[PDB]
Amino acid sequence: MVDYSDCFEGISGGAIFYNTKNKEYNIYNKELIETRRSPCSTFKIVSTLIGLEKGVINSKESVMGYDGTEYPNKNWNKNLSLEEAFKESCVWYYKKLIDKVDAKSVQNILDDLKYGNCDISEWEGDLKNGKGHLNGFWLESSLQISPKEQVQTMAKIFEGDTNFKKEHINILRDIMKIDVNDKNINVYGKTGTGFDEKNKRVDAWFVGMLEREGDTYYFAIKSDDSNKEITGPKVKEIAINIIKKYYSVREGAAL
Amino acid sequence: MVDYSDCFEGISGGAIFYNTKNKEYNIYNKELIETRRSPCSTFKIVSTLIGLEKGVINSKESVMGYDGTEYPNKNWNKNLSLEEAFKESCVWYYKKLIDKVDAKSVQNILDDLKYGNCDISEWEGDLKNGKGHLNGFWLESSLQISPKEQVQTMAKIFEGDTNFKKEHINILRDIMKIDVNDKNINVYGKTGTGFDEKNKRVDAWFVGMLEREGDTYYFAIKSDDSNKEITGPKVKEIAINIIKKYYSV
Structure with a gap:
């Protein structure tokens, strides 16, 4: 276990980072x-x-x-x-x-x-x-997945272990690219915002990967806070703060 | 890209002919x-x-x-x-x-x-x-190859670019020969029939070669139709109709 509570700032949630080289998980x-x-x-x-x-x-x-x-x-x-x-x-x-x-x-x-x-x-x-056609099995419906399962799915896709075409994975990487105002940080991800009416708690997500030097970290940041203000974009800021603090680059670091 | 959809009669599929002379592929x-x-x-x-x-x-x-x-x-x-x-x-x-x-x-x-x-x-x-011993890696199992790769393999074998002995390739040519009712062309080929249970589509094949007045074409005809009635033998009928309309002259 690791402690990233400092980056969550009281927001109820958790995080998992998986490194491809050490096969090790950093779990909060x-x-x-x-x-x-x-x-x-x-x-x-x-x-x-x-x-x-x-x-x-x-x-x-x-x-x-x-x-x-x-x-x-x-x-x-x-x-x-x-x-x-x-x-x-x-x-x-x-x-x-x-x-x-x-x-x-x-x-x-x-x-x-x-x-x-x-x-x-x-x-x-x-x-x-009442949202009509703004609905689907993946939007607070039958489909469910854990943050750890999300990271395992990413790793299989982006390490080239599935049957998806490389050119298709490359399209996904391109559209997943995030601008974090630091050209030294290569972050890719997708936000998710939903409310779990059964538990009266949000489903705030930021899932993706970090390419740091020759290393790759697949990650999933998730909040379940009762505050409906906690959304995917807020969980994304937490993820970036965790990356800059615990997964920063050695070479070309800011002075 | 060519079009042989007429010969398929609505059946889902494709065809590729390769001419080793000009290195050109005719692809449907x-x-x-x-x-x-x-x-x-x-x-x-x-x-x-x-x-x-x-x-x-x-x-x-x-x-x-x-x-x-x-x-x-x-x-x-x-x-x-x-x-x-x-x-x-x-x-x-x-x-x-x-x-x-x-x-x-x-x-x-x-x-x-x-x-x-x-x-x-x-x-x-x-x-x-449930077919027990009537199964193998090449029958709706781990081995997979595209129609284009089939043509490229056929070409390497019959153009003499592999390690196989010419004597053995000649035995294969002999057993592959089919009668098309036209002594002005030689047709050789093998059928294949399978059903992909996962995707609910047939794998119906006819792979071989055509020799007509100095020209040699390696070909692969393939169907991925939903209808299980579409077998290797049906795709062989389509292949012969393609050969008669586009490769006999």
Whole structure:
């Protein structure tokens, strides 16, 4: 176990970092990182690979066709590209993408990735929340996965141990790239924001990887705080603070 | 990219012809001809050469010894020759043949041929299908190769770029010959039939070569249709129709 409480600042949560070279895990709050929860928008990492593998999309510029629906996030109000849909967590884009994939292919791919409970039984999600077509099995619905399982899934995909094409993984790396105002830090990730009504707690995620010199760390930061203000973007700041403090570069460090 | 969709009659598939003279490929459905799939009985093209190279067989008359097992395919119920085993896609004959070759020898030969993924890890095949010994790594199992890779393998074998003896390649050419009712062209090939239970699609193949007035084409015809009625023999019919319309002149 390790203590990253200083970077959480009272926010209830946990973190796990896995290094490819030492095969060692750095775990903070062992019980929480082993608890399965809705992946929320972190599922976009996998749905992007499914869409590329099934030919629904083919590049970072791929579009799904916009029907003119007005959404709160104005970056959703257009025929946006895969890259923009990933960075803006655009649910309509990804719902239209996964509906063009047959259920058995998604099932086989989640089974092979060991993606948590691999439960896509509630395909359309929780329609009893009134959000209509802004729902799916990965949004506070049947699919659930633990932070440790997320890190194990990343490692298999990005270490080249799955059947996904290298060019498809390269598209995912490109759109996952984060700008942290330090060209020495190579961080890739995806946020997830959801509320668990059964436990009255958020599902705030930041999942990805850090390429530091010749080392690679797959990580998952997760909050379960009762404060509805705790979102994926806030858990992302915690992750970056943990990276800068405990996984900083030796060479070219700031003076 | 060419289009042979007419000859497929709505069946999902692709085709690739390679001309060793101008090094040009005629491709129908590029994404499908680059997709690796189980070779099924088209693997007999290579397992025949492995058996000959290793002395397990020596001629088109070679027999492997029949134990009296009664198979569903009554054409398998006798001590059949290599020629008959090849033409009837006799799995028991070829499994007994490959079982006499060390996995290291098969691995080195496939790696040297660049035979797709060269994955022979599931030697006994997919036993989950309940067929027991009628299974092998080349039958909806670990070994996978694309139609393009099939053509590239055929070309290396018949153009003399492999380690196989010319005498053995000639035995394979003889057993692969098919009658197309046209003495102005020579057609050679092998069918393959499988069903991919995971993806619910057939693997139906016809792989071989065409010789017509000085020109040689290596080809692979493949279907990935949902309909289990689509077998190697049906894809062979499609291949002959493609050859008659686009390669006879």
